[PDB]
Design a protein around this ligand. Structure first.
Ligand SMILES: OC[C@H]1O[C@H](O[C@H]2[C@H](O)[C@@H](O)[C@@H](O)O[C@@H]2CO)[C@H](O)[C@@H](O)[C@@H]1O
Ligand SMILES: OC[C@H]1O[C@H](O[C@H]2[C@H](O)[C@@H](O)[C@@H](O)O[C@@H]2CO)[C@H](O)[C@@H](O)[C@@H]1O
Ligand code: NI
Ligand code: NI
Lengths: 369, 370
């Protein structure tokens, strides 16, 4: 890492162009260059390169990964005063607190919603169960009912959790890392339903982020599942879209894992104080989050003042409703194992390489340790 | 069923469908006939299914290799250009679209993959595949990667597979021997092993697809990519300073991209065959028609003599044909789709490590020749 400059990592689906603008603002003021990068698999890269005193000064990701990073000593403890902390919602600080210590700045709260084409589908379905029928209706007109990223368990988890699936049993403010709920009747029922959609040709196992985004944004599919970041490209595509509550499964709300986009400071950084200044004084302000948000919507920001200003957006409202129906992700170190294990189970099951039960059985064992 | 009095066109989403739409607008302006260009996923798999029932597009666009099977399945109308029109297009492009004695599509343009490289990151791209690993180790220390390209489709990995002796079907006595497949021979195994090692040694990832490779190169995260003329538009817009050149050699031998002629077939079930003929002959296959499409996404070396002649000066086009002459024109026989799926499975299974190269290619050999 180079002293006297800021290197930033943020995921490619976030507003890195909006952010780089803030970084140029930071440069004009302090003369400090702010390079914004978006590496593939950055959540895997970071720990790798950071373990050897390398990487970016600042790293952006959902809060779930930061616990593991902190346990690995890859993060510097941030030092915001009470005046600053009070600018952000206490529940977002909660998401980035590990072992009593604040290990990153919260930026925004993210949740998946059902996104639907209002012209194709004036009244979107309330349930997963009515999708096969809808799809058959749309296939006759050369469209599909629903397409969404089947490659990342983040997009499929809401369905798996609906009827009883869960990652780690959470009771009395503690997660039981040995009480995993990926192979219970609930989790199996959800994943089986997904696999049945694929077998019945209502979806394809190889659908990923780009295939789904293209499909929805060109009006090839009536629905997709995505987060606030996705809205800008839809704006651009001019599809008349709405954002609403996710379909129920067996009468139960889908339960998305809620993410808090956070900014961590590399423990190897020689630019910690600079990192602090940039994050507290430029990014985490009404105009800073505005620049990012204009590029790619952040969702419900952690900054109270801007969250209030944007709260009137029905898309954000829908995002919070789904958020209330889901659960905020744990940030414990065991999350990476959980995600990896479930990713494998879903891909193996969807592709037909393994039975649902066998896939989730293996994921269950692998998530525990 | 197919609607009378309008044209519906299927074309893959990596091509200039907006450019083609403009040609359709000109067509509608002059004839009053609406032209709708669509880009379904998996269109080459959907066509034979829906055309069989009398459904689908009036015109399908795809590389010539698929059209043989569509023709054998009775899904394509024989096209009827007069001699005067055939003289407007290169004979070898008409050859690409002839099947069992009949013309079964209009050739549009010739495609071949080239090595695309970032001039600012890489002033002197590697001449060989063998020097890429050391090049990557070097760039990874600058926060970059040497090379990223779509590993999901065998079309992109084939140049390397074929370099040392891999092939689809052996030509004998004026026709392809459908039982002589060269996908599990030594050359084919050497090529796929080299790919697999690149993945094993963290120089590439098995999961890299088109979007990831295009994103990476167009943002200068990787110094090189592999792709065809359609991809150039997006690089232009990315402002990346790029060059189009000859693909790397493998074991001192040229990579051999499979050459495809983008072709336009008329659905045998279409009640708009005369409209399709007029659109294709009088609107698309003209200087002004190909130009509209090319300026959206470059076509490569177009089949129209006149337009090809003025574009030939383009260094990227010349580079495309340099790689195309080093390659082989794809067969158009019905067995191609079986070949492609067998190889697709093979490359994915081996790259993911779920199967060994030998096993993957041994299964692919049997499957293609099935
Ligand atoms: O799918 C596994 C993945 O889920 C979450 O990642 C999300 C991320 O939070 C979103 O902001 C967006 O970028 O999509 C990602 C999924 O592709 C977890 O945060 C992540 O740790 C986990 O691996
Ligand atoms: O990968 C198998 C695939 O290869 C060829 O498809 C090419 C096509 O020719 C290009 O124009 C471009 O669209 O990329 C495709 C590969 O993704 C064959 O034409 C096709 O039949 C075959 O399935
Ligand atoms: Ni990127
Ligand atoms: Ni499309």
């Amino acid at each position: 890492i180079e002293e006297g400059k800021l290197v930033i990592w943020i995921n490619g689906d976030k507003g890195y162009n909006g952010l780089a603008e803030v970084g140029k603002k930071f440069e004009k003021d302090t003369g400090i260059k702010v390079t914004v990068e978006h590496p593939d698999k950055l959540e895997e890269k970071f720990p790798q390169v950071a373990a050897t005193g390398d990487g970016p000064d600042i790293i952006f990701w959902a809060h779930d990964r930061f616990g593991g990073y902190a346990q690995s000593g890859l993060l510097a403890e941030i030092t915001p005063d009470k005046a600053f902390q009070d600018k952000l919602y206490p529940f977002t600080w909660d998401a980035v607190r590990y072992n009593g210590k604040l290990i990153a700045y919260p930026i925004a709260v993210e949740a998946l919603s059902l996104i639907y084409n209002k012209d194709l589908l004036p009244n979107p379905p309330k349930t997963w169960e009515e999708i096969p029928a809808l799809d058959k209706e749309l296939k006759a007109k050369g469209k599909s009912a629903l397409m969404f990223n089947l490659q990342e368990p983040y997009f499929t988890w809401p369905l798996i959790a609906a009827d009883g699936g869960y990652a780690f049993k959470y009771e009395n403010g503690k997660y039981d890392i040995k009480d995993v709920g990926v192979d219970n009747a609930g989790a199996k029922a959800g994943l089986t339903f997904l696999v049945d959609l694929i077998k019945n040709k209502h979806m394809n196992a190889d659908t990923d982020y780009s295939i789904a985004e293209h499909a929805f944004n060109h009006g090839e599919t009536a629905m997709t599942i995505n987060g606030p970041w996705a809205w800008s490209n839809i704006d651009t595509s001019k599809v008349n879209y709405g954002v609403t509550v996710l379909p129920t499964f067996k009468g139960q709300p889908s339960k998305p894992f809620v993410g808090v986009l956070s900014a961590g400071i590399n423990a190897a950084s020689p630019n910690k104080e600079l990192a602090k200044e940039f994050l507290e004084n430029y990014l985490l302000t009404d105009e800073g989050l505005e620049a990012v948000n204009k590029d790619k919507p952040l969702g419900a920001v952690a900054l109270k003042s801007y969250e209030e200003e944007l709260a009137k957006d029905p898309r954000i409202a829908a995002t919070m409703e789904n958020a209330q129906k889901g659960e905020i992700m744990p940030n414990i170190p065991q999350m990476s194992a959980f995600w990896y294990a479930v990713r494998t189970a879903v891909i193996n099951a969807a592709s037909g390489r393994q039975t649902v039960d066998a896939a989730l059985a293996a994921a269950q064992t692998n998530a525990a340790a």
